[PDB]
Design a binder for this molecule. Structure first.
Ligand SMILES: *[C@@H]1O[C@H](CO)[C@@H](O[C@@H]2O[C@H](CO)[C@@H](O[C@@H]3O[C@H](CO)[C@@H](O)[C@H](O)[C@@H]3O)[C@H](O)[C@H]2NC(C)=O)[C@H](O)[C@H]1NC(C)=O
Ligand SMILES: *[C@@H]1O[C@H](CO)[C@@H](O[C@@H]2O[C@H](CO)[C@@H](O[C@@H]3O[C@H](CO)[C@@H](O)[C@H](O)[C@@H]3O)[C@H](O)[C@H]2NC(C)=O)[C@H](O)[C@H]1NC(C)=O
Ligand SMILES: *[C@@H]1O[C@H](CO)[C@@H](O[C@@H]2O[C@H](CO)[C@@H](O[C@@H]3O[C@H](CO)[C@@H](O)[C@H](O)[C@@H]3O)[C@H](O)[C@H]2NC(C)=O)[C@H](O)[C@H]1NC(C)=O
Ligand SMILES: *[C@@H]1O[C@H](CO)[C@@H](O[C@@H]2O[C@H](CO)[C@@H](O[C@@H]3O[C@H](CO)[C@@H](O)[C@H](O)[C@@H]3O)[C@H](O)[C@H]2NC(C)=O)[C@H](O)[C@H]1NC(C)=O
Ligand SMILES: *[C@@H]1O[C@H](CO)[C@@H](O[C@@H]2O[C@H](CO)[C@@H](O)[C@H](O)[C@H]2NC(C)=O)[C@H](O)[C@H]1NC(C)=O
Ligand SMILES: *[C@@H]1O[C@H](CO)[C@@H](O)[C@H](O)[C@H]1NC(C)=O
Ligand SMILES: *[C@@H]1O[C@H](CO)[C@@H](O)[C@H](O)[C@H]1NC(C)=O
Ligand SMILES: *[C@@H]1O[C@H](CO)[C@@H](O)[C@H](O)[C@H]1NC(C)=O
Ligand SMILES: *[C@@H]1O[C@H](CO)[C@@H](O)[C@H](O)[C@H]1NC(C)=O
Ligand SMILES: *[C@@H]1O[C@H](CO)[C@@H](O)[C@H](O)[C@H]1NC(C)=O
Ligand SMILES: *[C@@H]1O[C@H](CO)[C@@H](O)[C@H](O)[C@H]1NC(C)=O
Ligand SMILES: *[C@@H]1O[C@H](CO)[C@@H](O)[C@H](O)[C@H]1NC(C)=O
Ligand SMILES: *[C@@H]1O[C@H](CO)[C@@H](O)[C@H](O)[C@H]1NC(C)=O
Ligand SMILES: *[C@@H]1O[C@H](CO)[C@@H](O)[C@H](O)[C@H]1NC(C)=O
Ligand SMILES: *[C@@H]1O[C@H](CO)[C@@H](O)[C@H](O)[C@H]1NC(C)=O
Ligand SMILES: *[C@@H]1O[C@H](CO)[C@@H](O)[C@H](O)[C@H]1NC(C)=O
Ligand SMILES: *[C@@H]1O[C@H](CO)[C@@H](O)[C@H](O)[C@H]1NC(C)=O
Ligand SMILES: *[C@@H]1O[C@H](CO)[C@@H](O)[C@H](O)[C@H]1NC(C)=O
Lengths: 121, 438, 432, 122, 429, 127
């Protein structure tokens, strides 16, 4: 369905990430419809901009160069990707996101400056 | 382990937004989008959620939407500012049977015609609740001490039709499926649906009309039921069928008040007049009150006597049972319908009573002259709910008197939008994975 | 072979969209943005002007813009008063007699307490006898507004231009039938400029056909479908109203005015209109020459006048100068086909309800002076009848009544397509 | 040429001018006609760009895919398509059997991306 | 040597766009986003970018939006078209008039004989005991709707995405020309939309001195916008004791008439300190002679003439609109104790120099007081032939856009164009 | 912060261009009456401008990247300054003032070069 694998395995919900990402685009009923559509467009363009600035644009899954911290999650991979849902994960890590966002941005900024001078030969 | 980025993970978070409705009138349907044939539904298996019905912004948004749609519709209609003149009224005498002595006033007044310098002499029957005695006798209309107001156009209809508040693009309407659901508290069985069901915008004050039947037991829902000032919503299992009708046979005469406008008035009654009597079955109501007291004893004390009574307010819209049968506004008894003391085929006739000048949505002066409707009116409707209010009584042999009530119109829509909460999805997420960039 | 994805292909599909106004007043050019052609070589494409969608959007836009133009003007509610009228006989012409009526009535001043006595002149088409006491004809359905003298009814051209993602395709076929395939299609940013004139039977100030007379119909066999005729040469007409009206201001309230016809300085004559005799004879000869192809050779084609109905549909109605004419045009459609001038008597009505609506009219104020006026006759709206078959005689009468057919004679070579730039194709490449 | 100047040109000649069609897709109460169509065009452009972005195909006009051509959609040879036909008919005979292609490209790219991280995990 | 493409580099070009409010009565505070706190500033230390006091779209959008919002807030209550009736007026106890007339009631047949107090300035005589209001031959307008207020609540204009607004920080910045220091800000300070004529009050002070700002100083057609350094305090009262009665016109619409005077009638007067005004005028005449000649005679006269809105200082103190004479302030000559001002009150108002729609201000009971600081003057020039050394600088006003050009001068809006190219010997492969 | 180092050197402002780009779409705090339709017009205009800026990077093969390179030669009549004095002691605002005329042709050279390069890249994959 739309997001019927929300309570599923985290490793099994990675298959169905396509069909959840297609539905972010879709007088009393005048300017209200207009405001709702503009707000949806703003949220989707903000998400695509945040993918683009980190350098993972055009890809639903991306792999980066930021080291993971033991203080962020002491749990190993045998429980996160086997018997733990994305909702419990995001409730666990809801107050830890901004530092990881800044480190991803810093790694993307430092990665590009070491490639412009590489092709100058 | 390394940081990796995922787009489109199923993660939601609570928020509020501007929903929209669709359907297949005073509620404007021609401005809405058409709904889909073969609708969809998604069940979220194996998940938990912490719903609350007493703090939705959906209810306030719906109340604002119905107020806006109601105020929009009466805007292109007749304003009736020449209408209140010094009315000279005599009683009707001609086919009075006992009980309507002194309720229909036959009024004579004179009025501007199509032309400006000419007056015509007309007449109309007005109800007693719409005339106020200025000191045959000189009466005036009740309305123009506070406001002059708009006659409803005779083509729009006040019949509720189902509307479906859909989610916007990027949000989700979460639906509960647990049967014994208190409102405040977790729902183990949660589903995602992109549209709500057919919520009918019905207007009632004490005995909530056509709607969703609960399928479990009769449910007593409140937010601080211990406190003595919160409305207690009760939802039934089986519907209680109620008859109401108007035995009179009205005829419309059309008085031309200006170059283009018209004022539809009561003519003369063809036949005999009687009260608008409202029926409800004895045994069905007895069994329903039995179920209510059965589910009320557990929570309110395992050995209680439960007393029902009648209302004690002063305004006519809270001590009565108002509804919208056919287009004529009723304002009924509900006092002999609640005369019982539960301790540890007949029909109850309710005198239902009709008033034309309507101050609804609890606002201090924007009325509506409801046009007369020609012929008899008969409605068959389902009682699916009940608004109760406990007294300020403390103790004395566990005696709690549950008088009816109402007032605020939000309580008629938290009996239908209780299994719904809007959330926004947040697709961005990070997780440990073995990846590195190349 | 392997599937490839191309983004930006030149294909299209038919669709309906909202087109914005563009211009180079009653027609509000303030909202329209201020104001190019690419030829296409090897494309042929189906066209249809009767299932078109720009004409209905044009007509609804014109109606709504006309309605919003008259919002802040005076309502003229207190003019619905009991008139007391007589005839006027300052040296009246024997044909024009009776038509103008002197009238006098009581009406309010700027002060709410006091009242005044004001006289005015009205036509017979504006007054109805009360059953000598008269009243206005609009005091029975809806009291309606008065046209403000600041604005004028000059038909300025307007362009409708499609937004991004849509294209407007224009035929360059010199002999376009109206339907069927178009051999040469040229795209354009938007159109050449359409003058939104109003007329009933004879099209005025329109666009000429370039080589010969075009005759277009949705179904030439069916009698109930109108016949549009477009000319290759223009026929010149004269509007004429030989009077000297005197507009005087009457104050009806605190800040409002009512402009009434005060007096006539001079003689009162009929308001005729002149069209040439020889040019109309040659143009009608071309029309009857190129109408015989669809109906058959050696067939007697004759023209009769209008059948009947109300005054707007039956008679020619134009709006040149500032007043509303209603011309007979019965001396034109009279011939039977096997420096003279035709004079047509016309009558003037002030209370005008334009777009066939009940309960919504408009009062036209009088125009001071004498009105001189010319225009071209560039088209007609004919209407046949259900005559008996195998009779070799068909009668053609000027119809009209609907306003869509006037603007369907200009948006006949335009359609809106929706660009879908996504497409697939097989090519021998592979992805590594 | 112009905006649609290669509509009469062939398949192999209109393939070199996709830029001029890709560029021009994104160019007083009754002024809402100017406002509603802009939001509609923005939503259509984001729908097309997202549909390109699902397939691992965004950012490029002429875009190749490793999915084989099933002959049930069209059985004619490649030799007489790219030089004896224009884009309008190639829209006409693939007016059908398109929504299945638009899903199999989606599943092929998702399995290719799955191949991408589990190749890089080791 | 091949072209590289950079995205997001900071350059801008000046542009015009639509702004929006932000804030924490008539001025719509409740329809604004809450403010954005401590916007940090930058320093373009090598800039020569020109600013413009006079030709920005900011003040035009301010004036248009204030006019449209004033027209919006006046709508949803009583319109007094039936009060335009004949009036029979006498004298009280000679400025106030005691007028009695006939008015409708809530019943459409009955009528009443009521009385009210009207000033001299808003009645004329129709042909000695038959009067009428002065708006009856031009309009029929709206009473000020007694729940709203006219307090100048602060309003911040905040710029959408893609645009930023700058901030000039130069101390001797005369409004036109390249300032040597350009900063930025997210959005503006607390501009208070007061209405004034020839005495700007409740505004922003100056930095080190008192500036003189104009298009050109050699033209007697452009206003000189003086902005003070030190605040000069003006305070006043209306000593009468009005009473408000509710005359009901019809079905639910009332009219608030002026009742009897409880105490004694005295004229309204606004006074200012003599020495503070003397030294502030001395500062103005000291630093103003640098543009007109170092040996010149500067003499100050009263207003030129015309309508009462441009001749007299007009302000709104709590709901009563004063029209004070201000002729005892601008009367001095210069060569190398309180000043009271007789002040009169008008009720029906044409605010934004518009003909066709007025505004009725209801009476307010009690005595009203307001303290305020004068932070600006709108002097003009009446020039002459070059044969004498005297300069005649009469104060003027009436143009409301010059009030909001006193603020918003260190603000210009730019549009960001982030795309840019550069030469580099690097190659994509 | 926003527009930081806008008066600094050309080389140091290349390290800063990641913070200008975050506020081209909206802020999150700013997401009937006079103000609402004005703010809606501002939001739609900002969305249109950001999409128009992103489209040109999409055409030239530079999508998803901030600093990139292209294979079009730089004609010496566009500018005669060498690399040492253009990236040091030169502000971006002073740099923009001499490509007022020359931008509309270098954009066309960019799009034609990218179309030719994409056709040549698609040619070699057929083997
Ligand atoms: C629901 O409403 C009931 C009303 O019956 C609340 O119970 C009463 O709450 C009030 C206010 O908190 C209490 O009054 C004060 O409370 C504390 C001690 O609890 C102290 O400051 C004072 O001595 C005073 O009593 C009151 O005691 C309490 N109980 C009764 C029997 O009246 C109840 O709190 C509300 N429920 C929720 C969940 O909020
Ligand atoms: C609860 O729902 C029932 C659904 O039937 C509502 O009763 C219906 O009320 C409408 C409106 O008056 C009736 O329609 C009218 O009926 C006749 C022709 O049948 C005619 O007068 C009108 O043309 C109009 O269609 C309808 O008959 C009636 N149906 C029944 C079975 O009684 C009822 O009003 C609802 N309760 C409320 C809103 O309180
Ligand atoms: C068809 O087009 C012709 C023009 O070729 C229109 O004739 C024009 O009629 C208007 C009537 O308002 C004239 O404008 C007015 O003229 C005088 C000054 O000459 C004055 O009253 C106004 O200032 C205004 O400009 C216009 O001069 C006249 N053009 C001529 C005689 O060449 C004709 O009305 C159009 N037909 C229809 C049905 O609209
Ligand atoms: C310039 O600004 C000052 C300070 O903001 C304004 O003085 C204030 O004027 C208002 C309006 O008259 C006063 O409000 C009123 O005060 C009392 C008690 O609150 C009462 O009569 C009313 O309910 C109303 O609120 C306010 O007190 C007063 N402030 C001070 C400190 O005295 C002044 O009016 C402004 N000058 C103008 C608009 O010309
Ligand atoms: C919620 O519970 C279900 C059981 O109803 C779980 O389904 C398990 O799925 C795995 C993976 O295919 C199977 O091997 C197990 O046999 C299933 N049953 C168990 C553990 O009892 C599942 O983890 C959850 N599913 C969803 C859709 O939310
Ligand atoms: C008319 O009705 C009123 C209202 O009850 C009553 O007081 C009065 O006596 C009645 N008059 C007659 C004559 O019945
Ligand atoms: C509502 O029922 C839930 C379900 O367990 C319970 O947690 C909660 O206390 C109840 N609330 C009230 C007021 O009875
Ligand atoms: C009140 O209740 C009693 C029994 O408790 C019953 O006899 C009586 O009829 C009731 N009143 C009504 C109006 O039903
Ligand atoms: C031309 O138009 C006529 C009239 O509508 C129609 O009968 C005929 O079929 C058309 N011919 C062609 C070739 O399109
Ligand atoms: C026509 O009437 C006008 C009305 O303004 C008048 O001025 C003019 O002299 C008249 N012309 C004649 C009688 O020739
Ligand atoms: C149109 O067709 C002719 C003949 O086949 C061909 O030479 C010409 O190039 C085509 N036009 C275009 C624009 O491709
Ligand atoms: C091709 O398409 C047909 C549908 O016509 C389908 O049955 C078939 O499985 C597809 N694949 C192959 C390899 O034939
Ligand atoms: C495409 O396939 C559909 C399948 O229903 C068929 O009806 C249709 O004729 C086919 N062809 C075209 C050109 O649409
Ligand atoms: C100011 O006035 C002088 C004297 O007339 C004139 O020469 C000058 O051009 C004016 N300045 C401007 C900027 O127009
Ligand atoms: C303002 O100052 C600048 C220099 O900063 C000067 O060029 C200009 O003439 C001055 N303008 C006026 C009106 O004095
Ligand atoms: C009013 O201002 C005068 C000077 O004009 C000053 O002396 C007095 O104290 C002020 N009154 C106040 C602030 O109450
Ligand atoms: C001038 O007076 C006003 C009103 O009291 C006050 O807000 C302002 O701060 C004063 N200006 C000063 C003290 O510089
Ligand atoms: C660019 O175009 C403008 C406008 O035609 C022209 O004046 C200017 O000289 C051109 N620029 C250069 C650097 O040649």
């Amino acid at each position: 369905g739309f997001l019927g694998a929300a309570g599923s395995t985290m490793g099994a919900a990675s298959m169905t990430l396509t069909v959840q990402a297609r539905n972010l685009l879709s007088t009393v009923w005048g300017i209200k419809q207009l405001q709702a559509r503009v707000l949806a467009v703003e949220r989707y363009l903000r998400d695509q901009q945040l993918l683009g600035i980190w350098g993972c644009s055009g890809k639903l899954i991306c792999c980066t160069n930021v080291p993971w911290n033991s203080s962020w999650s002491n749990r190993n991979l045998s429980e996160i990707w086997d018997n733990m849902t994305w909702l419990q994960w995001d409730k666990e890590i809801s107050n830890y996101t901004q530092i990881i966002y800044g480190l991803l941005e810093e790694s993307q900024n430092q990665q590009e400056k070491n490639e412009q001078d590489l092709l100058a030969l | 382990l390394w940081v990796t980025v995922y787009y489109g993970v199923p993660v939601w978070k609570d928020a509020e937004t501007t929903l929209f409705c669709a359907s297949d009138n005073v509620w404007a349907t021609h401005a809405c989008v058409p709904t889909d044939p073969n609708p969809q539904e998604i069940h979220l298996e194996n998940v938990t959620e912490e719903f609350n019905m007493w703090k939705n912004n959906m209810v306030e948004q719906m109340h604002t939407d119905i107020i806006s749609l109601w105020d929009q519709s009466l805007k292109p209609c007749v304003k009736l500012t020449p209408l209140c003149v010094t009315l000279q009224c005599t009683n009707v005498t001609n086919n009075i049977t006992d009980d309507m002595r002194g309720e229909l006033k036959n009024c004579s007044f004179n009025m501007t015609t199509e032309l400006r310098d000419k007056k015509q002499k007309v007449y109309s029957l007005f109800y007693r609740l719409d005339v106020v005695q200025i000191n045959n006798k000189e009466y005036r209309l009740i309305n123009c001490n506070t406001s002059a107001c708009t006659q409803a156009c005779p083509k729009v209809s006040f019949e509720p039709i189902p509307i479906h508040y859909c989610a916007p693009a990027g949000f989700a309407i979460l639906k509960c499926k647990d049967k014994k659901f208190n409102g405040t508290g977790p729902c183990p069985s949660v589903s995602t649906v992109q549209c709500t069901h057919g919520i009918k915008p019905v207007v009632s004050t004490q005995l909530l009309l056509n709607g969703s039947l609960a399928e479990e037991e009769v449910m007593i829902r409140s937010e601080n039921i211990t406190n003595n000032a919160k409305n207690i919503l009760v939802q039934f299992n089986t519907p209680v069928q109620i008859n109401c009708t108007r035995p009179n046979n009205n005829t419309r005469k059309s008085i031309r008040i200006g170059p283009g406008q018209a004022f539809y008035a009561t003519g003369d009654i063809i036949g005999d007049i009687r009260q608008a009597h409202c029926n409800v079955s004895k045994a069905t109501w007895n069994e329903t009150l039995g179920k209510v007291v059965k589910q009320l004893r557990k929570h309110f004390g395992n050995n209680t006597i439960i007393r029902f009574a009648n209302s004690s307010g002063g305004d006519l819209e809270v001590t009565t049972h108002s509804f919208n049968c056919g287009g004529e506004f009723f304002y009924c008894n509900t006092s002999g319908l609640f005369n019982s003391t539960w301790i540890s085929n007949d029909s109850i006739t309710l005198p239902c009573r009709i008033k034309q000048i309507i101050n609804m949505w609890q606002r201090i002066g924007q009325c509506m002259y409801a046009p007369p409707i020609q012929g008899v009116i008969r409605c068959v409707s389902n009682i699916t709910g009940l608004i109760l209010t406990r007294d300020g009584g403390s103790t004395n042999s566990t005696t709690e008197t549950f008088r009816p009530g109402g007032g605020d119109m939000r309580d008629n829509w938290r009996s239908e939008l209780y299994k719904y909460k809007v959330v926004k999805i947040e697709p961005l997420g990070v997780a440990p994975t073995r990846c590195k960039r190349r």
